[PDB]
Amino acid sequence: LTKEKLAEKLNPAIGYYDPLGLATADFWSQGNDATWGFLRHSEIKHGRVAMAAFVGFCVQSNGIHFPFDFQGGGVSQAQYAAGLSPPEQWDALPFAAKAQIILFIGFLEWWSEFGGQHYMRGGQPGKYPEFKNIPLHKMPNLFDPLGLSKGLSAEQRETKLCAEINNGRLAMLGVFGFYCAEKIPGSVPLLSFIKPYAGEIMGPF
Amino acid sequence: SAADGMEGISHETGMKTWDPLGLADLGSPATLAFFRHAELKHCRVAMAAFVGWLVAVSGVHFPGLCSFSEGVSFEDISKLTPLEQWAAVPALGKAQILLAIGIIEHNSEWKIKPHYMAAGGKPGDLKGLKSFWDPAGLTSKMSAAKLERQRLSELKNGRAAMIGIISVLIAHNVPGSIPLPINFPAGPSLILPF
Amino acid sequence: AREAELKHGRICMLAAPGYFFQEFFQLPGFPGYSPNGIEAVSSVSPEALAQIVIFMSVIEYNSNLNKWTMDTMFADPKREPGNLGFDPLKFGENKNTRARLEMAELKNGRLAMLAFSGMVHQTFVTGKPVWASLQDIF
Ligand code: CLA
Ligand SMILES: CC(=O)O[C@H]1CC(C)(C)C(=C=C/C(C)=C/C=C/C(C)=C/C=C/C=C(C)/C=C/C=C(\C)C(=O)C[C@@]23O[C@]2(C)C[C@@H](O)CC3(C)C)[C@](C)(O)C1
Ligand SMILES: CC(=O)O[C@H]1CC(C)(C)C(=C=C/C(C)=C/C=C/C(C)=C/C=C/C=C(C)/C=C/C=C(\C)C(=O)C[C@@]23O[C@]2(C)C[C@@H](O)CC3(C)C)[C@](C)(O)C1
Ligand code: KC2
Ligand SMILES: CC1=C(C#C/C(C)=C/C=C/C(C)=C/C=C/C=C(C)/C=C/C=C(C)/C=C/[C@@]23O[C@]2(C)C[C@@H](O)CC3(C)C)C(C)(C)C[C@H](O)C1
């Protein structure tokens, strides 16, 4: 649906709000429709990644940790070490683990760009295509591998997507609040309990 | 004059085209289009130059080194006066900066087929070089009247900027020009490109 | 003779501002600079004057290709006195002020010939540059 209608199903009070005017932009001389699709798919990607980041930060900072080991060869584990903060756990992971995680996410991103109609060229922003026609690889779909979300009938699905966009935006704000309280003292009134350091965070390796 | 439909009439001199020496009348509409393109180029270069001069005076610089071969850090170069900064840039760096600028200028004259010195002039029009001007579409939110106001503000700011850049460049070199007693940075008022 | 008059006037009205402002200003870092033109040309390296002369000769030869004699030049009826075609900004398309600009070019060129002659000979008389020689009169 249109920009005004979307921003009005997301928040009637605020309504459409775009000081930068990127919704009318023309990235790469592709066209306003394609560029609006690109912008919508990024927000949904940022929101999804941010919600996952928040729940992961919450789960792994408290102390929950997997038992099936990572380094291999009967070697001590750096990330499983005291109440280490999650960015420092990521740093403490070995380089091979980080590279392969990033490459797996890269394959997921490549498949999202590849399968199905593209979000820019008349495709739904945020739909993950189905893992089909890949030779010698049959895997559950990334979205709903169990498929227990059939029956919304396209009446509740759009409102659920609006809730996703919201929750995603709030998750971006929350996780960056965590990082800013962590690497800038006093950035948030709460979150002072977070440790004073993380690392560069914007540097994976 | 020939300069009535052109979009540069200010509110400070009044709503009459300030052409006291009548240079707009002398020449063709192609000549006046060349004048407008030159004015807008000088405006844009002067805005960028004044921002660069402020950056150089402040001392903020990129983290890194200009050349891994030559011992020229941005920290090292920031200690000189603004024009000796360019004098201290490496020769190859200056050469490729000028190469990029010249490529941009040649393509501006080439690929924008309805030329400024031609019918359907569009003198300062460099949009057409795709993704060069406003790659992010910031002005795309603006209507016709707002665009006209922004263009007038462009010309006003750039005119002031090209006055100011020359002012700061000459104020220390010839003392007493600018009445203010602020101690402008030393150094040349003019640098040869290589 | 109008082709010569215009050529001489153009050379002289490039020379006179050059002679008068080379005392005040220097090309940044140039060697052999002197404020007065005569010892300036004496001191400047010969392979700079040679390149200037080569530039002028290249322009003259390419502009006057196959037309260097009184008949060969102006053999073409269109070819006008001094109309070498150098007008990048196209002031000549406006034909209302063409006569004004032509007369102004002619008068300014003539005045520049006389002015450059005066500057050079005053420098010969005094041994000092143009502005110094002038300001030591009053
Ligand atoms: C008859 C013409 C003439 C001649 C023969 C010379 C000869 C000389 N000049 Mg130059 N000079 C001239 C005119 C001339 N000048 C003019 C008009 C000026 C501007 C005031 C200067 C300013 C000048 C300075 C500041 C210096 C010299 C110096 C010199 C000497 C070394 C060469 C050099 O560095 O040139 C430098 C040349 C210039 C800075 C620019 C020359 C301008 C040309 C002739 C204009 C023609 C191009 C045209 C306008 C462009 C058309 C554009 C169109 C396509 C749009 C040499 C004796 C140096 C000296 O003093 O050595 C003792 C020196 O430092 N000259
Ligand atoms: C300081 C002060 O004063 O204030 C503040 C400042 C500050 C920093 C902002 C604060 C914070 C943090 C905040 C606000 C953090 C917010 C985080 C947020 C908002 C995190 C959402 C995650 C959602 C997930 C993972 C959902 C997955 C959901 C999945 C995978 C689904 O299955 C969805 C589903 O639709 C399908 C696909 C199928 C349908 O059948 C229906 C269901 C539901 C099953 C504080 C602490 O509050 C303090
Ligand atoms: C009296 C005395 O003695 O001294 C006085 C006078 C004297 C001598 C003149 C002095 C001086 C110097 C002066 C006054 C210098 C002035 C310099 C000046 C005026 C410099 C402008 C730069 C502008 C830039 C770079 C803008 C870029 C802007 C860009 C690229 C935009 O995108 C604009 C944008 O709109 C679009 C296109 C679309 C919108 O959607 C978004 C925004 C809004 C972002 C003194 C010494 O200071 C004080
Ligand atoms: C204006 C924009 C600009 C562009 C678009 C651009 C693009 C590329 C590309 C891609 C096509 C490559 C592959 C490349 C490579 C190198 N660039 Mg380069 N470059 C630009 C600007 C400068 C400046 C200002 C300097 C510079 C340099 C170097 C050196 C170091 C050499 C060395 O250490 O000797 C290397 C290897 C420095 C230099 O040459 O220093 C003497 C230096 O100062 N570049 N550059
Ligand atoms: C062709 C063309 C173009 C052009 C052009 C250009 C570059 C034009 C340049 C013109 C130029 C540069 C013209 C100088 C005149 C100088 C004169 C008359 C000097 C008199 C000097 C005199 C009378 C001096 C006299 C004295 O010194 C004497 C003798 C004795 C001393 O004691 C002191 C005094 C002062 C008394 C465009 C615009 C670039 C493109 C377009 O397409 C068309």
mmCIF file with all atom_site columns, N, CA and C in Angstrom, chain A residues 17-71:
data_model
loop_
_atom_site.group_PDB
_atom_site.id
_atom_site.type_symbol
_atom_site.label_atom_id
_atom_site.label_alt_id
_atom_site.label_comp_id
_atom_site.label_asym_id
_atom_site.label_entity_id
_atom_site.label_seq_id
_atom_site.pdbx_PDB_ins_code
_atom_site.Cartn_x
_atom_site.Cartn_y
_atom_site.Cartn_z
_atom_site.occupancy
_atom_site.B_iso_or_equiv
_atom_site.pdbx_formal_charge
_atom_site.auth_seq_id
_atom_site.auth_comp_id
_atom_site.auth_asym_id
_atom_site.auth_atom_id
_atom_site.pdbx_PDB_model_num
ATOM 1   N N  . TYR A 1 17 ? 6.040  10.538  8.031   1.00 0.00 ? 17 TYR A N  1
ATOM 2   C CA . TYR A 1 17 ? 7.082  11.366  8.631   1.00 0.00 ? 17 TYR A CA 1
ATOM 3   C C  . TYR A 1 17 ? 8.400  11.005  7.960   1.00 0.00 ? 17 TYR A C  1
ATOM 4   N N  . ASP A 1 18 ? 8.940  11.930  7.171   1.00 0.00 ? 18 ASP A N  1
ATOM 5   C CA . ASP A 1 18 ? 10.144 11.676  6.378   1.00 0.00 ? 18 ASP A CA 1
ATOM 6   C C  . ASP A 1 18 ? 10.864 12.998  6.159   1.00 0.00 ? 18 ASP A C  1
ATOM 7   N N  . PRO A 1 19 ? 11.575 13.497  7.179   1.00 0.00 ? 19 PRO A N  1
ATOM 8   C CA . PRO A 1 19 ? 12.311 14.762  6.998   1.00 0.00 ? 19 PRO A CA 1
ATOM 9   C C  . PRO A 1 19 ? 13.341 14.714  5.885   1.00 0.00 ? 19 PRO A C  1
ATOM 10  N N  . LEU A 1 20 ? 14.032 13.586  5.724   1.00 0.00 ? 20 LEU A N  1
ATOM 11  C CA . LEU A 1 20 ? 15.022 13.467  4.664   1.00 0.00 ? 20 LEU A CA 1
ATOM 12  C C  . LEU A 1 20 ? 14.389 13.330  3.287   1.00 0.00 ? 20 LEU A C  1
ATOM 13  N N  . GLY A 1 21 ? 13.128 12.924  3.212   1.00 0.00 ? 21 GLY A N  1
ATOM 14  C CA . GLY A 1 21 ? 12.478 12.732  1.928   1.00 0.00 ? 21 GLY A CA 1
ATOM 15  C C  . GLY A 1 21 ? 13.071 11.610  1.105   1.00 0.00 ? 21 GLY A C  1
ATOM 16  N N  . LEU A 1 22 ? 13.468 10.510  1.750   1.00 0.00 ? 22 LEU A N  1
ATOM 17  C CA . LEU A 1 22 ? 14.039 9.386   1.020   1.00 0.00 ? 22 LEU A CA 1
ATOM 18  C C  . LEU A 1 22 ? 12.981 8.545   0.320   1.00 0.00 ? 22 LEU A C  1
ATOM 19  N N  . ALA A 1 23 ? 11.715 8.646   0.730   1.00 0.00 ? 23 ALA A N  1
ATOM 20  C CA . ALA A 1 23 ? 10.672 7.854   0.088   1.00 0.00 ? 23 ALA A CA 1
ATOM 21  C C  . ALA A 1 23 ? 10.489 8.251   -1.369  1.00 0.00 ? 23 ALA A C  1
ATOM 22  N N  . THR A 1 24 ? 10.695 9.526   -1.689  1.00 0.00 ? 24 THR A N  1
ATOM 23  C CA . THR A 1 24 ? 10.612 10.030  -3.051  1.00 0.00 ? 24 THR A CA 1
ATOM 24  C C  . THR A 1 24 ? 11.956 10.004  -3.770  1.00 0.00 ? 24 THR A C  1
ATOM 25  N N  . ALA A 1 25 ? 12.985 9.422   -3.163  1.00 0.00 ? 25 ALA A N  1
ATOM 26  C CA . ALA A 1 25 ? 14.322 9.462   -3.727  1.00 0.00 ? 25 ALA A CA 1
ATOM 27  C C  . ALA A 1 25 ? 14.428 8.561   -4.951  1.00 0.00 ? 25 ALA A C  1
ATOM 28  N N  . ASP A 1 26 ? 15.540 8.711   -5.669  1.00 0.00 ? 26 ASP A N  1
ATOM 29  C CA . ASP A 1 26 ? 15.876 7.893   -6.832  1.00 0.00 ? 26 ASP A CA 1
ATOM 30  C C  . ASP A 1 26 ? 17.304 7.378   -6.652  1.00 0.00 ? 26 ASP A C  1
ATOM 31  N N  . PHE A 1 27 ? 17.440 6.276   -5.918  1.00 0.00 ? 27 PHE A N  1
ATOM 32  C CA . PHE A 1 27 ? 18.741 5.639   -5.757  1.00 0.00 ? 27 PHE A CA 1
ATOM 33  C C  . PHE A 1 27 ? 19.141 4.923   -7.039  1.00 0.00 ? 27 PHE A C  1
ATOM 34  N N  . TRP A 1 28 ? 20.369 5.171   -7.489  1.00 0.00 ? 28 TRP A N  1
ATOM 35  C CA . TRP A 1 28 ? 20.964 4.491   -8.637  1.00 0.00 ? 28 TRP A CA 1
ATOM 36  C C  . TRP A 1 28 ? 20.186 4.718   -9.930  1.00 0.00 ? 28 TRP A C  1
ATOM 37  N N  . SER A 1 29 ? 19.359 5.764   -9.989  1.00 0.00 ? 29 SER A N  1
ATOM 38  C CA . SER A 1 29 ? 18.559 6.075   -11.174 1.00 0.00 ? 29 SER A CA 1
ATOM 39  C C  . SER A 1 29 ? 17.657 4.909   -11.569 1.00 0.00 ? 29 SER A C  1
ATOM 40  N N  . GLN A 1 30 ? 17.153 4.171   -10.581 1.00 0.00 ? 30 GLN A N  1
ATOM 41  C CA . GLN A 1 30 ? 16.345 2.987   -10.843 1.00 0.00 ? 30 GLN A CA 1
ATOM 42  C C  . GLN A 1 30 ? 14.859 3.291   -10.947 1.00 0.00 ? 30 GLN A C  1
ATOM 43  N N  . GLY A 1 31 ? 14.381 4.309   -10.233 1.00 0.00 ? 31 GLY A N  1
ATOM 44  C CA . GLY A 1 31 ? 12.971 4.647   -10.208 1.00 0.00 ? 31 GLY A CA 1
ATOM 45  C C  . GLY A 1 31 ? 12.442 4.713   -8.794  1.00 0.00 ? 31 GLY A C  1
ATOM 46  N N  . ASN A 1 32 ? 11.479 5.605   -8.556  1.00 0.00 ? 32 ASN A N  1
ATOM 47  C CA . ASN A 1 32 ? 10.970 5.789   -7.204  1.00 0.00 ? 32 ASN A CA 1
ATOM 48  C C  . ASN A 1 32 ? 10.322 4.525   -6.665  1.00 0.00 ? 32 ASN A C  1
ATOM 49  N N  . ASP A 1 33 ? 9.678  3.734   -7.525  1.00 0.00 ? 33 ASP A N  1
ATOM 50  C CA . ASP A 1 33 ? 9.012  2.525   -7.043  1.00 0.00 ? 33 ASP A CA 1
ATOM 51  C C  . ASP A 1 33 ? 10.032 1.505   -6.556  1.00 0.00 ? 33 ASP A C  1
ATOM 52  N N  . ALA A 1 34 ? 11.061 1.251   -7.366  1.00 0.00 ? 34 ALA A N  1
ATOM 53  C CA . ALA A 1 34 ? 12.102 0.312   -6.969  1.00 0.00 ? 34 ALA A CA 1
ATOM 54  C C  . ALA A 1 34 ? 12.835 0.799   -5.729  1.00 0.00 ? 34 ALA A C  1
ATOM 55  N N  . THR A 1 35 ? 13.088 2.102   -5.642  1.00 0.00 ? 35 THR A N  1
ATOM 56  C CA . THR A 1 35 ? 13.859 2.616   -4.516  1.00 0.00 ? 35 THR A CA 1
ATOM 57  C C  . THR A 1 35 ? 13.031 2.615   -3.236  1.00 0.00 ? 35 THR A C  1
ATOM 58  N N  . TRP A 1 36 ? 11.726 2.867   -3.351  1.00 0.00 ? 36 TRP A N  1
ATOM 59  C CA . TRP A 1 36 ? 10.835 2.732   -2.207  1.00 0.00 ? 36 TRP A CA 1
ATOM 60  C C  . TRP A 1 36 ? 10.770 1.285   -1.742  1.00 0.00 ? 36 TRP A C  1
ATOM 61  N N  . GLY A 1 37 ? 10.743 0.341   -2.686  1.00 0.00 ? 37 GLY A N  1
ATOM 62  C CA . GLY A 1 37 ? 10.815 -1.060  -2.308  1.00 0.00 ? 37 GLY A CA 1
ATOM 63  C C  . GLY A 1 37 ? 12.107 -1.398  -1.590  1.00 0.00 ? 37 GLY A C  1
ATOM 64  N N  . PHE A 1 38 ? 13.227 -0.857  -2.075  1.00 0.00 ? 38 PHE A N  1
ATOM 65  C CA . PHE A 1 38 ? 14.506 -1.075  -1.408  1.00 0.00 ? 38 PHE A CA 1
ATOM 66  C C  . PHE A 1 38 ? 14.485 -0.524  0.008   1.00 0.00 ? 38 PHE A C  1
ATOM 67  N N  . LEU A 1 39 ? 13.946 0.682   0.187   1.00 0.00 ? 39 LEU A N  1
ATOM 68  C CA . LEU A 1 39 ? 13.891 1.276   1.517   1.00 0.00 ? 39 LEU A CA 1
ATOM 69  C C  . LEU A 1 39 ? 13.013 0.457   2.453   1.00 0.00 ? 39 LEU A C  1
ATOM 70  N N  . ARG A 1 40 ? 11.853 0.004   1.969   1.00 0.00 ? 40 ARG A N  1
ATOM 71  C CA . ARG A 1 40 ? 10.970 -0.793  2.814   1.00 0.00 ? 40 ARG A CA 1
ATOM 72  C C  . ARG A 1 40 ? 11.620 -2.114  3.203   1.00 0.00 ? 40 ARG A C  1
ATOM 73  N N  . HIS A 1 41 ? 12.264 -2.785  2.248   1.00 0.00 ? 41 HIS A N  1
ATOM 74  C CA . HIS A 1 41 ? 12.912 -4.049  2.572   1.00 0.00 ? 41 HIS A CA 1
ATOM 75  C C  . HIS A 1 41 ? 14.075 -3.839  3.527   1.00 0.00 ? 41 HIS A C  1
ATOM 76  N N  . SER A 1 42 ? 14.795 -2.736  3.469   1.00 0.00 ? 42 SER A N  1
ATOM 77  C CA . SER A 1 42 ? 15.853 -2.501  4.470   1.00 0.00 ? 42 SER A CA 1
ATOM 78  C C  . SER A 1 42 ? 15.338 -2.294  5.875   1.00 0.00 ? 42 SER A C  1
ATOM 79  N N  . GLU A 1 43 ? 14.313 -1.493  6.071   1.00 0.00 ? 43 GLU A N  1
ATOM 80  C CA . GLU A 1 43 ? 13.722 -1.320  7.371   1.00 0.00 ? 43 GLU A CA 1
ATOM 81  C C  . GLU A 1 43 ? 13.289 -2.611  7.933   1.00 0.00 ? 43 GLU A C  1
ATOM 82  N N  . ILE A 1 44 ? 12.774 -3.510  7.103   1.00 0.00 ? 44 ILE A N  1
ATOM 83  C CA . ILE A 1 44 ? 12.249 -4.774  7.590   1.00 0.00 ? 44 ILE A CA 1
ATOM 84  C C  . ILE A 1 44 ? 13.408 -5.644  7.897   1.00 0.00 ? 44 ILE A C  1
ATOM 85  N N  . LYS A 1 45 ? 14.466 -5.553  7.125   1.00 0.00 ? 45 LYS A N  1
ATOM 86  C CA . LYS A 1 45 ? 15.673 -6.306  7.450   1.00 0.00 ? 45 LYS A CA 1
ATOM 87  C C  . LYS A 1 45 ? 16.315 -5.783  8.725   1.00 0.00 ? 45 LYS A C  1
ATOM 88  N N  . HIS A 1 46 ? 16.412 -4.459  8.855   1.00 0.00 ? 46 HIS A N  1
ATOM 89  C CA . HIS A 1 46 ? 16.978 -3.876  10.063  1.00 0.00 ? 46 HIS A CA 1
ATOM 90  C C  . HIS A 1 46 ? 16.139 -4.222  11.280  1.00 0.00 ? 46 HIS A C  1
ATOM 91  N N  . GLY A 1 47 ? 14.815 -4.146  11.153  1.00 0.00 ? 47 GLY A N  1
ATOM 92  C CA . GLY A 1 47 ? 13.959 -4.485  12.276  1.00 0.00 ? 47 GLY A CA 1
ATOM 93  C C  . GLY A 1 47 ? 14.092 -5.936  12.693  1.00 0.00 ? 47 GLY A C  1
ATOM 94  N N  . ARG A 1 48 ? 14.120 -6.844  11.719  1.00 0.00 ? 48 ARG A N  1
ATOM 95  C CA . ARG A 1 48 ? 14.250 -8.264  12.018  1.00 0.00 ? 48 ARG A CA 1
ATOM 96  C C  . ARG A 1 48 ? 15.583 -8.565  12.690  1.00 0.00 ? 48 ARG A C  1
ATOM 97  N N  . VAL A 1 49 ? 16.672 -8.073  12.098  1.00 0.00 ? 49 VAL A N  1
ATOM 98  C CA . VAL A 1 49 ? 17.998 -8.298  12.658  1.00 0.00 ? 49 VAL A CA 1
ATOM 99  C C  . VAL A 1 49 ? 18.092 -7.680  14.044  1.00 0.00 ? 49 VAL A C  1
ATOM 100 N N  . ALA A 1 50 ? 17.457 -6.523  14.243  1.00 0.00 ? 50 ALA A N  1
ATOM 101 C CA . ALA A 1 50 ? 17.538 -5.838  15.525  1.00 0.00 ? 50 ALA A CA 1
ATOM 102 C C  . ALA A 1 50 ? 16.765 -6.578  16.606  1.00 0.00 ? 50 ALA A C  1
ATOM 103 N N  . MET A 1 51 ? 15.585 -7.100  16.273  1.00 0.00 ? 51 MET A N  1
ATOM 104 C CA . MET A 1 51 ? 14.837 -7.900  17.237  1.00 0.00 ? 51 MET A CA 1
ATOM 105 C C  . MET A 1 51 ? 15.618 -9.149  17.619  1.00 0.00 ? 51 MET A C  1
ATOM 106 N N  . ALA A 1 52 ? 16.197 -9.823  16.622  1.00 0.00 ? 52 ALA A N  1
ATOM 107 C CA . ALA A 1 52 ? 17.030 -10.983 16.914  1.00 0.00 ? 52 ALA A CA 1
ATOM 108 C C  . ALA A 1 52 ? 18.214 -10.596 17.789  1.00 0.00 ? 52 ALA A C  1
ATOM 109 N N  . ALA A 1 53 ? 18.838 -9.451  17.504  1.00 0.00 ? 53 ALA A N  1
ATOM 110 C CA . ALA A 1 53 ? 19.976 -9.000  18.295  1.00 0.00 ? 53 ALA A CA 1
ATOM 111 C C  . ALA A 1 53 ? 19.574 -8.727  19.734  1.00 0.00 ? 53 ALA A C  1
ATOM 112 N N  . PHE A 1 54 ? 18.406 -8.121  19.940  1.00 0.00 ? 54 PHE A N  1
ATOM 113 C CA . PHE A 1 54 ? 17.962 -7.841  21.299  1.00 0.00 ? 54 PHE A CA 1
ATOM 114 C C  . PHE A 1 54 ? 17.738 -9.131  22.074  1.00 0.00 ? 54 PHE A C  1
ATOM 115 N N  . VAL A 1 55 ? 17.025 -10.087 21.472  1.00 0.00 ? 55 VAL A N  1
ATOM 116 C CA . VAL A 1 55 ? 16.740 -11.315 22.212  1.00 0.00 ? 55 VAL A CA 1
ATOM 117 C C  . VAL A 1 55 ? 18.025 -12.106 22.436  1.00 0.00 ? 55 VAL A C  1
ATOM 118 N N  . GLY A 1 56 ? 18.948 -12.089 21.474  1.00 0.00 ? 56 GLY A N  1
ATOM 119 C CA . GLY A 1 56 ? 20.216 -12.771 21.672  1.00 0.00 ? 56 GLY A CA 1
ATOM 120 C C  . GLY A 1 56 ? 21.056 -12.137 22.763  1.00 0.00 ? 56 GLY A C  1
ATOM 121 N N  . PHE A 1 57 ? 21.114 -10.803 22.787  1.00 0.00 ? 57 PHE A N  1
ATOM 122 C CA . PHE A 1 57 ? 21.811 -10.092 23.852  1.00 0.00 ? 57 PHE A CA 1
ATOM 123 C C  . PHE A 1 57 ? 21.225 -10.459 25.205  1.00 0.00 ? 57 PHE A C  1
ATOM 124 N N  . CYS A 1 58 ? 19.894 -10.484 25.298  1.00 0.00 ? 58 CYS A N  1
ATOM 125 C CA . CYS A 1 58 ? 19.250 -10.829 26.559  1.00 0.00 ? 58 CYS A CA 1
ATOM 126 C C  . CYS A 1 58 ? 19.567 -12.260 26.976  1.00 0.00 ? 58 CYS A C  1
ATOM 127 N N  . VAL A 1 59 ? 19.524 -13.200 26.033  1.00 0.00 ? 59 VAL A N  1
ATOM 128 C CA . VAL A 1 59 ? 19.702 -14.604 26.388  1.00 0.00 ? 59 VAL A CA 1
ATOM 129 C C  . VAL A 1 59 ? 21.150 -14.885 26.776  1.00 0.00 ? 59 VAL A C  1
ATOM 130 N N  . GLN A 1 60 ? 22.109 -14.387 25.994  1.00 0.00 ? 60 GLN A N  1
ATOM 131 C CA . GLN A 1 60 ? 23.504 -14.750 26.213  1.00 0.00 ? 60 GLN A CA 1
ATOM 132 C C  . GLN A 1 60 ? 24.206 -13.874 27.241  1.00 0.00 ? 60 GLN A C  1
ATOM 133 N N  . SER A 1 61 ? 23.716 -12.660 27.500  1.00 0.00 ? 61 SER A N  1
ATOM 134 C CA . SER A 1 61 ? 24.321 -11.846 28.548  1.00 0.00 ? 61 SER A CA 1
ATOM 135 C C  . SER A 1 61 ? 23.937 -12.336 29.937  1.00 0.00 ? 61 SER A C  1
ATOM 136 N N  . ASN A 1 62 ? 22.741 -12.910 30.085  1.00 0.00 ? 62 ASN A N  1
ATOM 137 C CA . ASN A 1 62 ? 22.324 -13.422 31.386  1.00 0.00 ? 62 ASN A CA 1
ATOM 138 C C  . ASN A 1 62 ? 23.202 -14.587 31.828  1.00 0.00 ? 62 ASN A C  1
ATOM 139 N N  . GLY A 1 63 ? 23.556 -15.476 30.901  1.00 0.00 ? 63 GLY A N  1
ATOM 140 C CA . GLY A 1 63 ? 24.423 -16.598 31.210  1.00 0.00 ? 63 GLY A CA 1
ATOM 141 C C  . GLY A 1 63 ? 24.142 -17.862 30.422  1.00 0.00 ? 63 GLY A C  1
ATOM 142 N N  . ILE A 1 64 ? 23.042 -17.894 29.669  1.00 0.00 ? 64 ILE A N  1
ATOM 143 C CA . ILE A 1 64 ? 22.700 -19.080 28.895  1.00 0.00 ? 64 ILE A CA 1
ATOM 144 C C  . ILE A 1 64 ? 23.746 -19.294 27.810  1.00 0.00 ? 64 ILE A C  1
ATOM 145 N N  . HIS A 1 65 ? 24.186 -20.541 27.661  1.00 0.00 ? 65 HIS A N  1
ATOM 146 C CA . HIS A 1 65 ? 25.305 -20.869 26.790  1.00 0.00 ? 65 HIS A CA 1
ATOM 147 C C  . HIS A 1 65 ? 25.192 -22.317 26.338  1.00 0.00 ? 65 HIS A C  1
ATOM 148 N N  . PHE A 1 66 ? 25.534 -22.552 25.072  1.00 0.00 ? 66 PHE A N  1
ATOM 149 C CA . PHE A 1 66 ? 25.337 -23.864 24.477  1.00 0.00 ? 66 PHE A CA 1
ATOM 150 C C  . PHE A 1 66 ? 26.381 -24.859 24.994  1.00 0.00 ? 66 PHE A C  1
ATOM 151 N N  . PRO A 1 67 ? 26.043 -26.175 25.062  1.00 0.00 ? 67 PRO A N  1
ATOM 152 C CA . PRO A 1 67 ? 27.020 -27.148 25.572  1.00 0.00 ? 67 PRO A CA 1
ATOM 153 C C  . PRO A 1 67 ? 27.831 -27.860 24.499  1.00 0.00 ? 67 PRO A C  1
ATOM 154 N N  . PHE A 1 68 ? 27.484 -27.701 23.216  1.00 0.00 ? 68 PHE A N  1
ATOM 155 C CA . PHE A 1 68 ? 28.074 -28.535 22.174  1.00 0.00 ? 68 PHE A CA 1
ATOM 156 C C  . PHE A 1 68 ? 29.390 -27.969 21.660  1.00 0.00 ? 68 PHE A C  1
ATOM 157 N N  . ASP A 1 69 ? 30.028 -27.063 22.413  1.00 0.00 ? 69 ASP A N  1
ATOM 158 C CA . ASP A 1 69 ? 31.395 -26.631 22.140  1.00 0.00 ? 69 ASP A CA 1
ATOM 159 C C  . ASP A 1 69 ? 31.520 -25.895 20.797  1.00 0.00 ? 69 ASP A C  1
ATOM 160 N N  . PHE A 1 70 ? 32.605 -25.120 20.601  1.00 0.00 ? 70 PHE A N  1
ATOM 161 C CA . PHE A 1 70 ? 32.865 -24.448 19.319  1.00 0.00 ? 70 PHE A CA 1
ATOM 162 C C  . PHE A 1 70 ? 34.276 -24.638 18.784  1.00 0.00 ? 70 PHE A C  1
ATOM 163 N N  . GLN A 1 71 ? 35.299 -24.565 19.636  1.00 0.00 ? 71 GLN A N  1
ATOM 164 C CA . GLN A 1 71 ? 36.667 -24.544 19.123  1.00 0.00 ? 71 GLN A CA 1
ATOM 165 C C  . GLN A 1 71 ? 37.057 -25.902 18.560  1.00 0.00 ? 71 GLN A C  1
#
